[PDB]
Structures are given as structure tokens and as C-alpha cells.
């Protein structure tokens, strides 16, 4: 392989220690000619098509937030900042399409690709936007999953979301800033063919591990753990509400059965199921809402012995007396028990599906990186004699998908009409 820049040594810079291809200077040309080449003629508008959309769908959206001046709040608060990040992530590719591949990352004066931190600022601009906003976006996602778990399993309330979020919002920004400035001091930034961007990892696999292979696994993992913990807490709450409802209905219906049946045998035969259900519901249970169950079971205790001792209508009246104590405690606690889970299920499912949808693209991104490192492993040493274009063009696309979800998650005609009437004036 000979069109992989065997430019003559100019002594410095880099012409003595790049070690590409096990030789002093045989390295990388600006486009990618040995895996697709002319297919880049398509790709020159491919990432263009999505990028403008991934601006527009979020361009209004944060502005929509600035219409409301924080209407939706703390359990939906990091949606705003996560949506905000993709604006700049798209804006970098907008800068790429307003300048072009042939001047922002192609070496102006030495005809290979850009390496390291450039003096005149050009590559560093789009690197700063893409890397900093990218990593910060994934951090906003994982603290959103933290908010989801704290609202689902702990249910600590919006003020308790606020008190932690006042620290955690400024805590989130630091980690991408840290990794960005360590990358910039290390100056492992470089161009990437069939992109025009300025990212990391084209120099070496160890840089790819040091920036993007590790954290993208890590943040994804610590988001998914919180997500599944919240979901299993939700299902536990759902099944315990269901069985408490079952106890309530087999209490009430069977009491009515007692009320309209006669004879001395089936009254005890039904009241024993009543006592069983009342004990089962008291075990689930708050102190007055368990004391009511206690005095209910004691009322059935008053009821049953007269049925044993050959009194039928005395048992009937003893059974009838329960209704008031059912009403004054058991009913009014079942109402709030049902209402809390209904208020959770009608809304936090609608929020957690954003997480469920989000988790897939991040994984496909780290899988695409894990295959591109093997592909570069295959091709790097392959020189002299001897003796998958779609996975490339997919990766930048699926980085940009989440932004247009913020163009569809914010779809609500009521608040759009609020925006229109607010802005009409």
C-alpha cells in the first residue's frame, strides 16, 4: 500500500516518531480511500440531511422552555439541559458544512490530516463543542435516571429533588470539562476521515480507550442500574396495590353475601374468609390506618362467637356494624393508596420511556466503536506485498437521534398555543 502518505521527512514536526505502519513516516491521507473511498461522495450530504433536522427539532424546544420560564420542573428538569447539549453538537456539524472538509481538518500546510492542538484555532472549536457537549449530554441523561429512581423507589418529592439538584446540576458539568481539558493538555485530538470533524482516537486505540471507550460504558451502566431498580420497585408497588385491592373486594362482597344469606353454618363459613382477608390486608398496611384494621378484626371477633353459639341475626347485626369503620379508615386510606400509584403510573411511565428509548442508541454507539477498533486493527499494519460502509455512516447519525426526540417529546398543542398567544402580543 503506497497512497498512504509516504511524504519525505522534513525532520520536524512528527516526521520521526509517529510509528504508523511500523515505519518512520507512512500514515493517513485526509479522506478514507481504502474502505469505501468513492462512497464518501454519498456521505458528503448524508450527515448533512440529519444534522439540520437535529438542529431544528431542538432549536425551538429550549426556546419553548424560555417561553414558559420554568413551568415544568424538577422531575423533568434535566430534559431541558439534555436537549440543550444537542444544539451545539449539531452546530459543530453546521460549522463543518459551512466551511467544508477540505479546510477545517485537512492539513493546510502539510497535506496529511490534522494532529494535536492546533495553534490557529480551527479544529479545536468543533472538538470543544462535540466532545464537551456530547459527554455532558450523557451525564445529564444519567442524572435524569437518578431522578427517575429517586422519584420512583424513594418518592422523596419535588422539594427533595430541588435540594439535591441544586448541587447535582453544577456537579454534572465538571466531569466532561475534566476529560476535555485532560484531552486538550494531552492534545490527542485529531481529524477523522469521512467526517470533517475534530475528535479523538484516530491516532491510537489507547486514546480511544482513554476518552470514549471507557466512559460510554460507565455512564450507560450506572444509568441502566438505576432504571431497572426503579422499574422493579414500580412492579412491586403495583402488585402490592393489586393484592390489597383484592383483599378489600373480597372483604366487601363477602360481607354483603353475609348480609343477604341466612342459616347458622354459611355465616361462619363466610366470616372466616372475612377474618382471613382482614388479617392479610392489615399485614400490608399509617398508625390509625392500621389501628382501624385492628378494631375491624376485633369487630369480626365479636361477630363470630355468636354464630358459634347459635345466634344468627345477632351475627347479622354484628356484621352490619363494620361498614362505618370500613368507611372512616379503610376506604379513605385505600383512596390515597390507589391515587398515589395512579399519579405515578400516568406520568413517570411517560418520563421513563425516554430513558428506555435513549439506552439503545448509546449501546449501538459503543458497539460501533468496538467494531471500528477491530477494523483499524485489521488495516493498520497491512502494507506492501505478501507471500461495511453503513456502519461507518451510521455512527454519527445515531449520535444525533436523541435531539429529534426532544422535537417529539415536547409535542403538546396546549403549550404550543400558550407559546403562540404569549408571542403574538
Amino acid at each position, epitope marked *: 500500500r503506497e497512497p498512504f502518505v509516504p511524504i519525505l521527512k522534513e525532520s520536524h514536526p512528527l516526521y520521526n516518531k509517529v510509528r504508523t505502519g511500523q515505519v518512520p513516516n507512512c500514515a493517513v491521507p485526509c479522506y478514507q480511500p481504502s474502505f469505501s473511498a468513492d462512497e464518501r461522495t454519498f456521505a458528503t450530504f448524508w450527515i448533512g440531511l440529519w444534522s439540520v433536522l437535529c438542529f431544528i427539532s431542538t432549536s425551538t424546544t429550549v426556546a419553548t422552555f424560555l417561553i414558559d420560564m420554568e413551568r415544568f420542573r424538577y422531575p423533568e428538569r434535566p430534559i431541558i439541559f439534555l436537549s440543550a447539549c444537542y444544539l451545539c453538537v449539531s452546530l459543530g456539524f453546521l460549522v463543518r458544512l459551512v466551511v467544508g472538509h477540505a479546510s477545517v481538518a485537512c492539513s493546510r500546510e502539510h497535506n496529511h490530516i490534522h494532529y494535536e492542538t492546533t495553534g490557529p484555532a480551527l479544529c479545536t472549536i468543533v472538538f470543544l463543542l462535540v466532545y464537551f457537549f456530547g459527554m455532558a449530554s450523557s451525564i445529564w441523561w444519567v442524572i435524569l435516571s437518578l431522578t427517575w429512581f429517586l422519584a420512583a423507589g424513594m418518592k422523596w418529592g419535588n422539594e427533595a429533588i430541588a435540594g439535591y439538584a441544586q448541587y447535582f446540576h453544577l456537579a454534572a458539568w465538571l466531569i466532561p470539562s475534566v476529560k476535555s481539558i485532560t484531552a486538550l493538555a494531552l492534545s490527542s485530538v485529531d481529524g477523522d476521515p469521512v467526517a470533517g470533524i475534530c475528535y479523538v482516537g484516530n491516532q491510537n486505540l489507547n486514546s480511544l480507550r482513554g476518552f470514549v471507550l471507557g466512559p460510554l460504558v460507565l455512564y450507560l451502566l450506572v444509568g441502566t442500574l438505576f432504571l431497572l431498580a426503579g422499574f422493579v420497585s414500580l412492579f412491586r408497588a403495583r402488585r402490592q396495590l393489586a393484592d390489597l385491592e383484592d383483599n378489600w373486594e373480597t372483604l366487601n362482597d363477602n360481607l354483603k353475601v353475609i348480609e343477604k344469606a341466612d342459616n347458622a353454618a354459611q355465616v361462619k*363459613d363466610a366470616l*372466616t*374468609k372475612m*377474618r*382471613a*382477608a382482614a*388479617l*392479610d390486608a392489615q*399485614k400490608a398496611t399509617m398508625k390509625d390506618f392500621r389501628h382501624g384494621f*385492628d378494631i375491624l*378484626v*376485633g369487630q369480626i*371477633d365479636d361477630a*363470630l*362467637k355468636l354464630a*358459634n353459639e347459635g345466634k344468627v341475626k345477632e351475627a347479622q347485626a354484628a356484621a352490619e356494624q363494620l361498614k362505618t369503620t370500613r368507611n372512616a379508615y379503610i376506604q379513605k386510606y385505600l383512596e390515597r393508596a390507589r391515587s398515589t400509584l395512579d399519579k405515578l403510573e400516568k406520568l413517570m411511565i411517560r418520563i421513563g420511556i425516554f430513558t428506555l428509548l435513549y439506552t439503545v442508541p448509546a449501546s449501538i454507539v459503543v458497539a460501533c466503536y468496538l467494531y471500528e477498533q477491530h477494523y483499524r486493527e485489521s488495516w493498520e499494519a497491512a502494507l506492501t506485498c505478501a507471500c461495511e460502509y453503513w456502519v461507518l455512516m451510521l455512527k454519527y447519525f445515531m449520535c444525533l437521534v436523541v435531539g429529534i426526540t426532544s422535537g417529539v417529546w415536547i409535542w403538546s398543542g396546549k403549550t404550543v398555543e400558550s407559546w403562540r398567544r404569549f408571542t403574538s402580543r
Partner: antibody
Amino acid sequence: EVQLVESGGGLVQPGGSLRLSCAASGFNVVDFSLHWVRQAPGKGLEWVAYISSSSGSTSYADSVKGRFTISADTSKNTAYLQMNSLRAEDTAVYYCARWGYWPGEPWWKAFDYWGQGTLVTVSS
Amino acid sequence: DIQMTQSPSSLSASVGDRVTITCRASQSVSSAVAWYQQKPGKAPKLLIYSASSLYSGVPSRFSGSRSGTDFTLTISSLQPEDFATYYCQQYLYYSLVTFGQGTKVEIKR
């Protein structure tokens, strides 16, 4: 500690009658119910009768209805079971047991402080 | 009224083994069942009350559990003292107390 004792065992003719006395030392019996639990020889346990003299609530198992009767004065802190017309099955060992009222913990505990019980036989 | 069935009615087990004795209620009792040990000759002893809670004084190799209407005592380590009979006993009202058949544990030989 609380302690129980059974008395009145032995042998009777069939169709006889007998009184078993369960005396409870320590705890008083206004606050705790007494039960009687029967083990026929080479069998599992089975249930007979109870009493709980805070209200007087005497029940009987179906095998002993119309044959067994009970009393429990709390001034002597003891209980009395009278059996009449002994069918020859009723040869067994009898136990006196304790059980606490609703609510709270002593109802959730079942029978805990058992007396060691005595044997009666339908000697023919 | 309700029926209590106890299944592993005779168990041969070596010293230091793990045994499980189940129990099944005919109706749906709530968490209201107990496990008793009777050694031959003496009065029985409480061992487990309210399905899973331990009584005070007994060693902690014994355990109990409930799955719906199916209750289970497990001994993790078979002590060389614990060769006796274990009876399953529900309670619900006072006049409805019924006992299981009782299983005997035996020395493996």
C-alpha cells in the same frame, strides 16, 4: 416463669365420667385463654375445646360435642374439663395450653406454654 | 373446617444435612401458621410462630417461609439433637385450630 400442671389421669370404665384439672402457676387466667389438645397414641395431635374466662367463650370440637363440658374460675386460677360417656377411642394423652387475646403479640404467638399432660384410658 | 396437609411424612437424613418440610392449607389462611417440635415422651415445644418469625430461645438453624398458601420449615444444618417430630399447625379463630399430620426425621444409615 409461668408453669402449668395437669391432673386427674388414669383409667375408667367405658361410659364413665372424669374431670381433668389444669392449674396455671404464675400468670393469671383472666388475661389468657386455655385450650385442650388431645393426642391419641400413635397419632398426630388434635383439638378438643377451649375457654377464655374474660368473657366465657366455650367451644368444642365436633367429636366431643354433646359429651364434654368445661369451666374456668380465675379465683383458683385453674380449669376443669368434664367428660361423660367415654367412647373407647377417647383413650389418649391430654394437654392444657395457653393462648393470648387479640390484639398484639400474645395472640400472634400460638400455644407456647404447654403443660405436660396426662393419660386416660377407656379400661374395659 | 380447613384441612392441613403435610407432605414429607418420613425423612431419612444424615447428620448436618439440610431438610425442608412443607405444609399446605386447604383454604387461604393469612400469615397464621406455626411449627412445633415434639420429642417422644414429652410435651411439644414451639419452634416457629407467625409463619416466619422465630420464637425466643430456640436455635437459629430453623427457618420458616410462606409462599401464598404454601408454608415451609427448613433446617439448614441437621443438628444431632433435632431428631424428633415436627407438626404444622394453623390458627385463625380460636375454635378453628387444626394440626398437620406430623413428619418424623430419621438417621441416615
